[model samples]
Target: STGSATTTPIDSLDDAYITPVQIGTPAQTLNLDFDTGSSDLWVFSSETTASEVDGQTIYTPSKSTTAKLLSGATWSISYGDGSSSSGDVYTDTVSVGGLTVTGQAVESAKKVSSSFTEDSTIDGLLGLAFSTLNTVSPTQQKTFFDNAKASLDSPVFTADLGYHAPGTYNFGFIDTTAYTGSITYTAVSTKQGFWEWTSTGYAVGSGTFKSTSIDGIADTGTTLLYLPATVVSAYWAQVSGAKSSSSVGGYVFPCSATLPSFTFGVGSARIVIPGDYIDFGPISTGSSSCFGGIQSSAGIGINIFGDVALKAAFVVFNGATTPTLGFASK
Candidate 1:
């Protein structure tokens, strides 16, 4: 842990290492989240009404001359947890970390919840995972990377940066650190905005689950590795006293005992995730152990592989024309 980068989720961005981006032009600058899980571009706007926007950080159009609004299209998004929002689709010339992409699709949310508004640091969410999960594509079909891919200088992109806020998740770029070794790249067919992959297979300990063989997509912006419950039940049975506590909802077990080491093979490479990752940072409810990452969705269609899987390996996201997600330097 001494040499490892510190990543912490935050409630706000009073202290954050942010790269500024321009809304409509290289001249308009804004700081946004670099999420690898989902793909979409959004910003708080002055044009959004007080009723439409609750307590989120508000960005005045004067600060950005490039911010544009869609004429009639309405966009809606809902998280797995059931949080939802609606907005109008718009186009803007967007820029990130001084990198500018012209005529980009953006979401101008007319209505936002209190949780989103209360945090002033959440200017916008940047999705770089794949085109399949693009939220702005129902009508506009534009991805920030899609616009910038042709101009990128290299086939390799890396996230060597760290974000360490208590309740906030920070995003950084890719392929800048020293190569621990050569990264194994996976060739994929781009369906939409994301590079889609079929689950192919999933095994816990040594038991292979056929249901886990469905086709799913991997996202870096999402925080946890989501798996189906049937797979979770069979896998958790291997651990000592691990069970589904109604209070915990996910997998809850005794902290006093050692948990089993579970490995999930995404492609040809086997990703072994230790049990300790799910042991901490939970709301205690008088149980022997608390829950960190829990199983809720079958998510048979989507496999969101977040930082947990990423920290174990070096990943190269190539968008220089033929897009691919490659693994390297374990």
Candidate 2:
């Protein structure tokens, strides 16, 4: 049956959103980050080193009768921000909201990077990207959505991420009541296992909307928007006190700076991101300087429309043969 689950933002400016999920027969409940940038459902498990456990919850596969080892299967993944997790594989029944998948691959982490170990709130990650990005070796694995797609009335999921608030993630169905205005649909390119598309153009606040095209990905796990270096420079040029800070990293500006809104074009949809959202909290408490939420994805090759952009709209991730992204104002 189609179902909806609530996702809560953990930090300001929606650094990340977490949803509760149950795994195995007895259903060990855990709060997991629903990451659209990666395709591997991994958890901090019993296999993890005690010293590395920190305050995080660990999944005990032996406690679940339905859990079975994949035998020699292992997974390792490194995120763009340098966070990583690697572990053994187990097949178990995993449930999200009311939707359940019996043979879902659950990567139980034996090793995790400092970034993950330090974040006690995020026990694991539930990957929503394409199944092809699954890290299981020798045999690729299907994501929870992919495994449950056939049972769903429709193969689609909607991400209603909120800013400093709670939102909902709906699977197999769309809730028209959650969004306003008509949803503008645009084609997505999954060549890189991401929900990527070409934006028709962009512009700073009140500036002319340029017609140049730029390819980008919509990533929910990431905290901020990342654009090309040239584009970032052009936008910051409009902000009086904005400058690249070696101490702060990326661009930082005076907290009192009057920022301009940033807009991007997706097909015929013109998504506008409010300027204030770009002012990602203060770099250091009580300081008059703040780090920008938008940065350059220069070396990465693809721009990322992270929380700052997604929170501005109600997004529909269509899981058709040719997947598409549908956007509407929240």
Candidate 3:
């Protein structure tokens, strides 16, 4: 079946993008972060530690007649940012948009990281990475997309993120009207359990496009755009007085400095990231030193094209036997 769902950002652009999911027979809806970086459709639930429970919504499996315990199963996941969650698993009727799956493994949180503990904006996370990345022990579980793939009109799903508004996640058929121009397709490398691909090149402002290959994951879970230091350095150098500020523990510059737009190529197609998008905000509430949304990933080992890069285009995650990724300008 083909379907679609809406995801709204907690901070509109600063934090996680969440989709409403209906779980169990009675249908308990929860706002869950739709992360393509990891694999585990976990949630805050009645099983969560009492102390871990705060303002976030919870899924009560006990209230759903269709809910069934996935005996002897458990899952735990840690993110690049250090936040973590873990708990037992259950199988129940799960629905996203209008697409539904039965007996979908839904991990219930028993312990949670501090970052999500008091955050009411998000209830849990739904990971879209390859099922190989799932943390379920003994018997690893498949992702919602994986289970839904067979029934999809086409074995694919798309992500259309927003900058200051809401986004859409479409399953099966592609929404032709969501994007413009043409989509550039690229083969994906999921050996590492991510939607990994190589960018043909990049350019800052009207500068000539560099001929190079940048390997990175298209991660919706990540907050910023991470690239090689050399690339990031070049982009910042174009901005007057921008420097890596240790005080803020990142690259920052005068708020008044005008920034040049960043562009990356996918095959023959180029998607431009606006300069204003790079000036992510300030070091402090009203500080003059604005943080760079596009930062260096030298120490991190791998570059990441996260939501910052995604919001500029329509992305398709093809779930064919051999997965593929597509990017289209909007």
Candidate 4:
């Protein structure tokens, strides 16, 4: 079977992309962040203390007759960004696009970190990563994709993220119409519970591609691209007035500064990210200072090809054996 869903950017910041997903019977619709970085389908729910929830739309399992409590089962998860949520579990129908999975484990939040409570627009998160990454107590839960993969014609999904624009996530099928040129494939390791891959090397602007390998995750939940400190420093050195400011956080540069393109090598495939996308946005109001979307992946200890870099390509997360990723220009 084949299915598709439309994804929309949260704001001009191009931080997160949200898609409509139906959970429980009779379809309790919620706008969820389709995150490939983590595996947990969680939502704000009636179980969450009223005080803990701000203006978020909460899902009430009682409203769905088909909803059933997963006895003694619970889940808690934290993101790399420091946002976290914990809750009980319920088995219900979950649908995205035209694909639906029955008896899917849906986590209903009882508590959420301040960061999540503050992001009121994102009602929940639909984890698209491997099911092994799930964090439920008593027993691990399978992701909606894992449950639906059996019926799919092919175990593959494509992410076509756009810059400050709407995007598309296609399931079980590759839409050749969405991309141009040949799709170059690269091997991915799921050992880290992510779309983990090793970049043969990278280049700043027109510089020749280096030969060093950089291990990284292809994370759609993350907004900015993060690389090693040395790599980040080298890139900023090419930009005028770029500096790492603790106050502003990460690297900042002049808004009018011309930026060089970034190129990453996937084996022999060279994917170039536009300079305009690297200049994330202005750092402050009424200021010409802007922040570079490429930052240091210091504490995280791994590079991240977040939305900043993903938007430049039509990416295929092939879930079959060997787990290869295919990329093409969008």
Score every model by TM-score: 0.73, 0.97, 0.97, 0.97
Look at candidate 3 and give me any clashing residue pairs.
Answer: 1-151
**Candidate 3 CA-lDDT value:** 0.90
Q: What tens digits encode model 1's per-residue C-alpha lDDT throughout 189-287?
A: 566445555544556655553434534445545555566676667667777777787765667666675655556555665555565544443346455
**lDDT per residue as tens, model 3, 1-330:** 987899888873456688999999889999988889988999999989889888888999899999999999999888887789999999999999999999899999999988889688889888899999999998999999999999999999999998878989999999999999889999899989999999999999999999899999999988789999899999989988899987677799899998899999898889998887676777778888888988999777789999888888899999999999999999
lDDT of 4 by residue, 1-330 (tens): 878999999888787899988887788899999988999999999999888898888889999989999999999998888789999999999888988889999999999999888887899999988889999998999988888887888999899998889999989999989998889988899988899998888899998778789999988889999999988998999998899999988999999899999988878888899998897778877789998999999998778999998999999999886788888886
Q: After superposing candidate 1, which stretches have Cα over 4 Å from the reference?
A: 1-8, 11-31, 49-55, 118-121, 129-141, 159-179, 199-214, 255-260, 284-288, 294-296, 299-301, 320-322
Local accuracy of candidate 2 as per-residue lDDT tens digits, 224-303: 99998888999999888889887777999888887899998877778888898798878888989888988998777779
lDDT of every predicted structure (CA atoms): 0.55, 0.89, 0.90, 0.90
Supply the TM-score for candidate 3.
0.97
> Which residue runs does candidate 4 get wrong by more than 4 Å?
none
Q: Give the number of the best model, judged by lDDT.
A: 3
The ten-residue window of minimal lDDT in model 1 covers: 1-10
